[PDB]
């Protein structure tokens, strides 16, 4: 599990910057965000944002360091339902009994 990211290139990261560049959270424009080769999940511009902020007006910010904290734990993405014992873990996406 990594944490914050600056502005070398933004790709595959969480919902944080989504609202920043309104193209993807306002409308479906994250695909066109890839600039010029699209004519010839997250993928942002070539490298336009450099802060851990909220972009109404660049006000709620925090320019700093990016952690890489390795958690030694097992990560399950799509657990399924087996009712022998009480439903353990999770369902695909809807139900979360955990």
């Amino acid at each position: 599990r990594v944490e914050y990211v600056k502005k070398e290139r933004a790709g595959l990261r969480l919902p944080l910057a989504a609202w920043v560049e309104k193209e993807a959270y306002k409308p479906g424009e994250i695909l066109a965000e890839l600039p010029e080769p699209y004519l010839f999940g997250d993928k942002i511009v070539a490298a336009i944002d450099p802060e851990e902020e909220v972009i109404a007006e660049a006000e709620g910010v925090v320019h700093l360091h990016e952690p890489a904290s390795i958690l030694v734990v097992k990560a399950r993405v799509y657990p399924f339902e087996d009712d022998v014992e009480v439903s353990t873990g999770d369902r695909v996406a809807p139900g979360d009994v955990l």
Binding site: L64, D96, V97
Partner: protein, 345 residues
């Protein structure tokens, strides 16, 4: 072994392993704590459960099992069944409200985390309010309580960081503690500052006279309503008590409390008094008319110290009548057979 070092090492070690970054970590945790609040409230909104209950159930699941609920708070929340029911409804909260549940817990977590990290802050502060009359550990502890207090009110929206905020909320907690627990006989915070002012003033007055100020100077230098009676009083309250058990006389084997006599206890002389007094008082009380003798015997000797309100139905004129005529016949025959004359007191 010895207690200061162990705790110092204890939290200094954990800060050493986790100090909070200036901005990021404190911001992070802060944001999470607040969201917790907004979460818990929205939870109360949708559950109809008091935010106090929603707060205690997320606490149990993140801070401790049935063990922490049963011993600390005696027993109103069923150790298992109760808290669990509460967690079930939280689960039932669809995608929308379930979100707040998950946030609340993570928030609560952050909370404790921000609290751990800024413990060096307390100790650094608490370090200076040392020789006030409280143990360093006691001092750090109250200050700790103070930092927890801060956590509840910090608004991260207002850019200033927790450092400067904790300082105040801690310094307040400490000073209070110093004023409330430091002495054997409680003294309100006002009397405290008063005594500090009194002390400080005596200092500036020691400065030039070469004469430990008579309580004249102190009154003057202090201000508006200060007089000799006031300062002599304050410094009389300022002297802490003494030890009923202190090494006395030549320090060999002398314990201070054998010297103090006793007052309520009837020294033999008194027990003998009450015996004759009551037997003789009881002999007279019977040979009389009960009407106004018992009235005044009971009104005076049975409940509390009202001529009119002393006699039942018969008005004042029969009261004074028999009171003063029986009281004198009683006194004058007691003058004959002198038994009472020798003032039992």
């Amino acid at each position: 072994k010895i207690s200061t070092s162990d705790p110092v090492r204890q939290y200094l070690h954990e800060i050493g392993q986790v100090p909070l970054l200036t901005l990021e970590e404190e911001v992070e945790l802060a944001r999470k704590v607040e969201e917790g609040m907004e979460a818990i409230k929205k939870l109360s909104e949708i559950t109809g459960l008091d935010p106090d209950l929603i707060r205690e159930v997320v606490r149990a699941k993140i801070l401790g099992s049935a063990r922490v609920r049963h011993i600390p708070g005696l027993k109103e929340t069923l150790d298992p069944k109760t808290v669990e029911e509460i967690d079930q409804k939280l689960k039932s909260l669809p995608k929308e409200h379930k979100r707040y549940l998950h946030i609340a817990r993570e928030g609560e977590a952050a909370r404790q985390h921000l609290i751990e990290a800024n413990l060096r802050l307390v100790v650094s502060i608490a370090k200076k309010y040392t020789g006030r009359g409280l143990s360093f550990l006691d001092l750090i502890q109250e200050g700790n309580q103070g930092l927890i207090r801060a956590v509840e009110k910090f608004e991260y929206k207002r850019r200033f960081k927790f450092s400067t905020y904790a300082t105040w909320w801690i310094r307040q907690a400490i000073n209070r503690a110093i004023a409330d627990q430091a002495r054997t006989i409680r003294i309100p915070v006002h009397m405290v500052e008063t005594i500090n002012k009194l002390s400080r003033t005596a200092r500036q007055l020691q400065q030039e006279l070469g004469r430990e100020p008579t309580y004249e100077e102190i009154a003057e230098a202090m201000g508006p309503g200060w007089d000799a009676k006031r300062v002599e009083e304050t410094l009389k309250i300022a002297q802490e008590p003494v030890s009923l058990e202190t090494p006395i006389g030549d320090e060999k084997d002398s314990f201070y409390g054998d010297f103090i006599p006793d007052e309520h206890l009837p020294s033999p002389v008194d027990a003998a008094t009450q015996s004759l007094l009551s037997e003789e008082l009881e002999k007279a009380l019977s040979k009389l008319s009960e009407r106004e003798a018992m009235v005044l015997k009971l009104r005076k000797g049975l409940i509390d110290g009202e001529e009119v309100g002393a006699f039942f139905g018969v008005t004042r004129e029969r009261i004074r009548q028999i009171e003063n005529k029986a009281l004198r016949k009683l006194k004058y025959h007691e003058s004959r057979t002198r038994k009472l004359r020798d003032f039992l007191d």
